[PDB]
Each structure stands twice: as C-alpha cells, then as structure tokens.
Ligand binder design. Structure first.
Ligand SMILES: Cc1cc2nc3c(=O)[nH]c(=O)nc-3n(C[C@H](O)[C@H](O)[C@H](O)COP(=O)(O)OP(=O)(O)OC[C@H]3O[C@@H](n4cnc5c(N)ncnc54)[C@H](O)[C@@H]3O)c2cc1C
Ligand SMILES: O=CCCc1cc(F)cc(F)c1OCc1ccccc1
Length: 647
C-alpha cells in the first residue's frame, strides 16, 4: 500500500506506535484506539508526502493542505505529528529546497567535530532548526570515509562504494536529492585459483555450500548450545569455525576407520574360508584316490564311495559360493573408499576465499569477531538489491556540505566541556603554529572509533571521558580494509561481471587482493585487501602492490592482455591519522550494547549534557555503514535540539 509503504521506507511499523512515539504522545497511547489509528494515518501520510518528493521542504501548512477530510480538520494533531517527524529527521532531512528561509537570528552554538556523513547530516539538521553550527574538519575535503578518486574520466571510491537495499534505506531519499547514479551489482562472481585457472563449477558450489554449513554450525554452537565463553574468554567466530572444522575432520577419519575395518574383516573371512577349502580339497583328494583303489560288498562300496565323494564335492561347491559373495563384497569396498580428507589442499584454499570474503564484510580477521554478536544487526537489513555508486559516492557529502560553515584543514586537538559551555581547540594542518579556540554550548563528536582508540590520544578531553565511555571504546572493534585502484585505457576483463575472485595460496594471506570489482564507466578495476593482509599490505609501496595485482590479472587473462595501468591509487586506512581503520566491528567481548554506550552523551558533574556522539560506531542497528552514520547524525541533531530548544 501507499501510506503503509511510507512507514516501511521509514523503518517504522505502519500499524502501531513505536515506543519513541509513545513517549512523545502519551495522550495518544492512553486514549481510544480510534484516535491511535488517526495518529498512525497522519504519521504515515506525512511520511508519504515527504518521500514522494524529498527535493522540497514539507511544511506543516502543505501537509495540512494535502490531507483529505477528516484528517485536515485536526489541525493541532497534524502539527504535533509534523513537528515530531521533523525533529527526528524522518522528514525534511538531507538536502532539499527550503520554503521557509533560515532564521536570521540563531539560537545556540554547536561545534561539530568531523565533516563526514554523520557530521554533515547533523549539521544540516541543526542549521534547519535555527542553530549556529560550525564543522571543524582535519582533512582538506569533506566526506571522511566517503572518499572518491577523480581524474580525467576516472572515478573510483576508496572508502564506501555500496548502497545496500533501498527498501527502508534513508540513502534512497538522499540518492534522489543528490542525483546519485546507482547500479545494481550482478551477483555472478567467478573464482580463479592462484595459478589463474577458473574454479570448476562443481567445486565452486561444493565448497560454497560447505562454507554455509560451517557458518550455520557456529551459529548453532552459539545460539542453541550457548558455547560463547571458554576458559573465561569470549569465543571468536574464527575460534568456533576451527572447532566445527575439527569435528568434520574427526567425522572423515571415523568413516575411514569403519571402512578399513570392513575391509580387514572381509579379508579375514576370505583367509579363513580359503584355508578351510584347502583342507576340504585334501580331504577329497584323499577320497578321490580311495575311489580308484576300488563282489557284493564292492558293488555296494562304489555306491557308498560315490555317495560320499559327491557329498564333499557338494560341500566344496557351496563354499566356493560363499567365496564369491565375499570377494565381490571385498571388490566393491576397495572401489568405494570414503573420502581420504575433509578438504583437499585446493578445496581449503577455496574455502579460505569465502572466509576472506567474510573478513572483508567485517573488516577484520575472523578470530577477532564475537561469536555471539558479530551479526547482531542482521534483523535490520534493508530489502532490495545492493548497488554501487557509478558517479562516485563523494557526490553525497559534497552536496550535503552546501551552505554549511565548514573549516577544512582544522584538526581538533582538545575538547573542554563544563556545566558552563564548551571550548574546542584546533590547529591549522597547513601551519600547525596557528591555533584556534571555538567556544560553544555543545560539542557533537563524530571522530571515528579508530581516532578515539588512539593512544596517546589524538584528541584530549578535559575532563577526561568517564570510564564507562572509555572502556566501551577499548572493547569495541575497529577494523581495516583497503583498495587498489587500477585505471586502464582498455577493458580486458569480462564487462558483464562486476566481481571476480582471486583464490590465495595460503590461509594467513587469504585476504590479499582476493576480490576484484568492475564498477565504472572508464576501464577501472578495484582490488580489495582484507583481513590480516589489510594492515600488513599498507607497508608495501604502491608500485609493488600494483605489480602483484598485475601478476594476478596476467594469470587470469593472459600476460599480453594486461597493459600497464595509466593511473593507480592505493588506500591505507589504518595509517590514515584521521581514520585509523575502516569501520567498527563487534569484537569478541563486545556487544551491541557498546554501540549504545558510544551514543550516550556526557554531562559534567553536578546539569545538562554538553558532549554528544555520532558516527557509524554509535548506532547499534546500522553500524559500519554510510546510512548508519547518516541516521546517527539525524539522531544527535534531534537530541541536541531537544536539549537546547525544548522537546
Ligand atoms: C575502505 C572502506 C570501505 C567501506 N565500504 C562500505 C560500503 O561500501 N558502504 C557503506 O555503507 N559503508 C562502507 N564503509 C563504511 C562507511 O564509509 C562509514 O561507516 C561512514 O562513511 C563513516 O561516517 P562517519 O561520519 O561515522 O565517519 P567519517 O566519515 O570518518 O567522519 C569523521 C570525520 O572526522 C574527521 N576527523 C578525524 N579526526 C579529526 C580531528 N582531530 N579534528 C577534526 N576532524 C577530524 C575525519 O577526517 C572525518 O571527515 C566503508 C568504509 C571504508 C573506509
Ligand atoms: O566497500 C566497503 C564495504 C562497506 C560495508 C560495511 C558494512 F558494515 C556493511 C556493508 F553493507 C558494507 O558494504 C556492502 C557489503 C555488504 C555485505 C558484505 C560486504 C560488503
């Protein structure tokens, strides 16, 4: 349906009130059910008006004018619902044409640290709400971990590049607003072994299905058997995977043992039976001779010796009947051995590609992921196919930056917050002698988790952050993932596949250049460096790592088919001082709850909150994504306006 679709697209149940709405509308939840349905229709229709045209501000008046009778008669309720949706960034978010120009006198000063998607999303909200907002950004550009390389006709994303399903995804709104060219990813992903040979289809399917089985077994261990703690330590996904593989190997060795036992027993029966048949020949050879050694007692002696001879001969033919039914049982047993091994050496390498793919998705070696919680956010996945941004994902933060007071090359060094306000201290990155002091009423910190983890600290908080916050910072995972960009003047790969895989030769290096992406107008290939390889490869120069790419590609397509690239770029996110990694993951011994602790604002002791937090590491249901960063900025903007302008 139409207004039901609008609730779904807003990640809301179309036919009941959320807890958040119950808090804000307690008179509605406690009142008659009929009025609750009116509330839900006003809410849903208001979201539909916005989602149907997110390029213009949806005002209260225009909401009222487009509601059909009887709904356009309860002016007060319509206003209450519009204001609530607006305050929480469910309408009039992103970048859109303002109908109401900005208030000329501001109310409250907010310093936002960092001009990534979360800081930008919050900044636009707070500016719409009539506040004085300034973003301090250490880089010479906006976007943070959205970072697009552009040169000539080449476009390639070094940070985020994939939009997950559009159903429920706020990026569907921003896409319409910014005019992103999205393109669905084709799922075919052929694999090539380290010698460049294609993986045969049957081995590809067999190994992939084994990967699915092994992973489901860890989830059974975790969520049915509650094997999550061992020797007082949290179990990791990698650790659980090693256990389920050990049991598969045990199973192979057992069935092998059973099979050898069947062989041996059959051999022993034949050995015994032949020995018995031997003695029966000796017994018949002795009688067959006493049949030639030969009257009335003689005419009856032949009858008796023929009766005796041919009975042993019938005994012997029957034993040769069992002799065949045994050595034919032996013959098919030797021809049907169970498997020698669980995984052939090549099978294992292929299985390690699927693990590498998973270390890509989580940005970290599997031995670091929480067995119990590594996928705690699964239930919030959007619907629809995934897409890539053919024109470069930077179009989103560049569009969101329009009209904001943004200070580039301005690195925050110290954040001071008291019950009387805040001071942010920053230095010019092009001239670190120049110092700046920004006074404000509130600070919104969107610093990446990697920067918050840095010891000694990059940014100093005065007073120091509370222990409950720093230990959450300490527990949470912050992973790494890197990309080599290869720009050619000609397409030598299969233009109709967006993905192909390189199967590494060893487990430890399985994430090295394991996945290639064909996404762009110009002849560009992105290769991923995942897992353990991601951090280690940053110590390799561009030319050497490009050379290793070209060797892989020369192995797959032929040495003469691969020309030298015209441009190359290599990300080093861990070594990047303004990121120190790629994105959070749920570390063993962490949980979703640490994401909630990260979102919690700080209040100076006895008072009102001064220091606020946004960023991909602060949103439990959508971590490590652009849409999660965006949603987190909208959330903190609502919280800050509630504090400084009233709920
Ligand atoms: C390699 C890679 C691949 C990814 N792929 C997937 C994908 O395809 N799709 C997806 O949805 N997500 C993906 N992500 C994750 C996604 O990009 C991030 O979750 C999101 O961009 C983070 O936004 P943020 O606002 O939380 O942080 P950021 O974008 O990092 O914003 C924080 C900002 O603070 C700035 N800053 C740092 N230190 C200081 C300081 N001292 N003073 C001032 N400013 C400072 C930084 O420069 C930055 O601009 C990927 C990320 C990376 C790096
Ligand atoms: O390019 C960087 C990948 C960024 C990323 C980080 C996430 F936490 C979740 C994602 F959806 C995602 O991007 C698409 C993706 C989906 C599944 C498996 C791997 C990647």
């Amino acid at each position: 349906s139409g207004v039901e679709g609008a609730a779904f697209q807003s990640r809301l149940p179309h036919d009941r009130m959320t807890s958040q709405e119950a808090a804000c509308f307690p008179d509605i939840i406690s009142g008659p059910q009929q009025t609750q349905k009116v509330f839900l229709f006003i809410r849903n229709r208001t979201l539909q008006l916005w989602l149907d045209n997110p390029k213009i501000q949806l005002t209260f008046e225009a909401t009222l004018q487009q509601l059909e009778a009887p709904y356009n008669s309860d002016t007060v309720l319509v206003h209450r619902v519009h204001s609530y949706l607006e305050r929480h960034g469910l309408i009039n978010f992103g970048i859109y044409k303002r109908i109401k120009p900005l208030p000329t006198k501001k109310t409250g000063k907010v310093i936002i640290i960092g001009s990534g998607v979360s800081g930008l999303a919050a900044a636009r909200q707070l500016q719409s709400f009539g506040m004085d907002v300034t973003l301090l950004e250490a880089r010479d550009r906006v976007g943070g971990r959205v970072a697009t390389f552009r040169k000539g006709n080449y476009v390639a994303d070094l940070g985020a590049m994939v939009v997950t399903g559009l159903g429920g995804n706020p990026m569907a709104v921003v896409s319409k607003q910014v005019n992103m060219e999205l393109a669905k990813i084709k799922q075919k992903c052929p694999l090539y072994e380290a010698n460049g040979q294609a993986v045969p289809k049957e081995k590809d399917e067999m190994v992939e299905q084994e990967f699915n089985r092994l992973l489901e077994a860890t989830s059974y261990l975790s969520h049915q058997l509650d094997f999550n703690v061992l020797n007082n330590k949290p179990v990791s996904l990698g650790q659980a995977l090693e256990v389920v593989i050990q049991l598969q190997e045990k199973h192979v060795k057992d069935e092998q043992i059973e099979h050898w036992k069947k062989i041996v027993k059959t051999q022993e029966e034949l050995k015994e039976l032949l020995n018995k048949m031997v003695n029966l020949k000796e017994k018949i050879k002795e009688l067959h001779q006493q049949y030639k050694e030969a009257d009335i007692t003689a005419e009856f002696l032949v009858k008796s010796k023929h009766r005796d001879l041919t009975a042993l001969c019938k005994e012997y033919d029957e034993l040769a009947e069992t002799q065949g039914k045994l050595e034919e049982k032996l013959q098919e047993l030797e021809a049907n051995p169970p498997s020698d091994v669980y995984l052939s050496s090549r099978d294992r390498q292929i299985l390690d590609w699927h693990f590498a793919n998973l270390e890509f998705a989580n940005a970290t070696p599997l031995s670091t992921l929480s067995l119990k919680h590594w996928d705690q956010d699964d239930d919030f996945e959007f619907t629809g196919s995934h897409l890539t941004v053919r024109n470069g994902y930077s179009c989103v933060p560049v569009a969101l930056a329009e009209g904001l007071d943004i200070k580039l090359n301005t690195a925050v060094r110290q954040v001071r917050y008291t019950a009387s306000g805040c001071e942010v201290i920053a230095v010019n990155t092009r001239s670190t002698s120049q110092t700046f002091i920004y006074k404000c009423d509130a600070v919104l910190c969107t610093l990446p988790l990697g920067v918050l983890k840095q010891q000694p600290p990059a940014v100093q908080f005065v007073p120091p952050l509370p222990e409950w916050k720093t230990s959450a910072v300490q527990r949470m995972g912050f992973g790494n993932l890197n990309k080599v960009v290869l720009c050619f003047d000609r397409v030598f790969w299969d233009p109709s596949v967006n993905l192909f895989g390189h199967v590494g030769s060893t487990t430890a290096s399985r994430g090295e250049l394991f996945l290639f992406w064909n996404l762009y107008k110009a002849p560009i290939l992105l290769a991923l460096v995942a897992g353990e390889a991601a951090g280690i490869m940053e110590n390799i120069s561009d030319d050497v790592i490009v050379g290793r790419c070209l060797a892989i590609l020369k192995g797959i397509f032929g040495s003469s088919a691969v020309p030298q690239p015209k441009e190359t770029v290599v990300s080093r996110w861990r070594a990047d001082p303004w990121a120190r990694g790629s994105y959070s993951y749920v570390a063993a011994g962490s949980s979703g709850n640490d994401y909630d602790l990260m979102a919690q604002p700080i209040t100076p002791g006895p008072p009102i909150p001064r220091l606020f937090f946004a960023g991909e590491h602060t949103i439990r249901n959508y971590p490590a994504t652009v849409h999660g960063a965006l949603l987190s900025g909208l959330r903190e903007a609502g919280r800050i306006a509630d504090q400084f302008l009233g709920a």
